[PDB]
Amino acid sequence: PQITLWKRPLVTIRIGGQLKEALLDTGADDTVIEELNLPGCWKPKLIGGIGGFIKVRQYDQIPVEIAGHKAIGTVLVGPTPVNIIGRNLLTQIGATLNFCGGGGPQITLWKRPLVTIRIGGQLKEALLDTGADDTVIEELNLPGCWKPKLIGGIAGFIKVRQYDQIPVEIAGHKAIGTVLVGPTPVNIIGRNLLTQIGATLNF
Numbered sequence: 001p002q003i004t005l006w007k008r009p010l011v012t013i014r015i016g017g018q019l020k021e022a023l024l025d026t027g028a029d030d031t032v033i034e035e036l037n038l039p040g041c042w043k044p045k046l047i048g049g050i051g052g053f054i055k056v057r058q059y060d061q062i063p064v065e066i067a068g069h070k071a072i073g074t075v076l077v078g079p080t081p082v083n084i085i086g087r088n089l090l091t092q093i094g095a096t097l098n099f100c101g102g103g104g105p106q107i108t109l110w111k112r113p114l115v116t117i118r119i120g121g122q123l124k125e126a127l128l129d130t131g132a133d134d135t136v137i138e139e140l141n142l143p144g145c146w147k148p149k150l151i152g153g154i155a156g157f158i159k160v161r162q163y164d165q166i167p168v169e170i171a172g173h174k175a176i177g178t179v180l181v182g183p184t185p186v187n188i189i190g191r192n193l194l195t196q197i198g199a200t201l202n203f
């Protein structure tokens with residue numbers, strides 16, 4: 001299919017013989033699912049995101065059907081806020097990110113989808129994250145009025161400053177919208193701006 005990003009890219013998956021809902025997440029290296037039992041042995045791991053880290057159980061070589069497409073790979077199980085399908089399985093099902101519906105660059109998911117952005121007259125690197133509702137940029141002295149906000153990721157919540165109507169050029173494509181500024185470990189471009197540049201998931 002081709003999936004646009006006006007809504008969360010939620011899909012049904014089948015795993016261990018059970019159906020679950022999960023978010024297609026280009027900003028996640030790995031696939032993380034809420035607590036459940038999986039056949040096979042597991043080992044302890046920690047994974048991170050906004051706010052730090054959680055403990056998970058790593059299961060290897062798990063079959064997962066994702067919208068009807070087969071994958072067999074690593075599934076982390078633990079207290080994630082949302083079930084996410086990460087790049088390890090997205091690559092198996094042939095998923096790419098495409099600008100302007102495929103008229104623009106195609107970004108494969110073998111490595112983190114990092115691109116150059118321009119914001120407040122600065123160039124920065126940022127991750128295209130279909131699993132992010134909002135755009136979050138590392139602490140940056142933007143002039144202007146802001147409102148406080150809290151946003152939440154794998155390890156908890158962080159406090160950010162919300163600025164509205166900020167232009168953000170993404171790989172040469174002009175967007176304008178809300179930007180959150182705070183202590184993120186990676187600058188994140190979320191769906192609010194991805195939709196403006198016609199970015200789609202395709203597989």
Ligand SMILES: CCCC[C@@H](CN[C@@H](CCCC)C(=O)N[C@@H](CCC(N)=O)C(=O)N[C@@H](CCCNC(N)=[NH2+])C(N)=O)NC(=O)[C@@H](NC(=O)[C@@H](NC(C)=O)[C@@H](C)O)[C@@H](C)CC
Nearest residue numbers: 027028029030047048049081131132133134151152153186
């Ligand atoms: C879990 C909630 C949905 C997925 C997540 C994907 N975000 C990326 C951000 C990338 C880092 C800043 C992420 O968590 N990626 C993880 C996913 C876990 C995983 N293992 O794949 C990752 O790749 N982690 C790497 C990064 C390294 C961590 N640090 C380190 N090694 N030192 C890792 N392998 O642990 N989205 C979010 O965290 C966003 N949250 C949301 O969009 C929504 N919030 C919630 C609570 O659902 C909305 C309601 O606010 C944040 C950014 C606010 C807009």
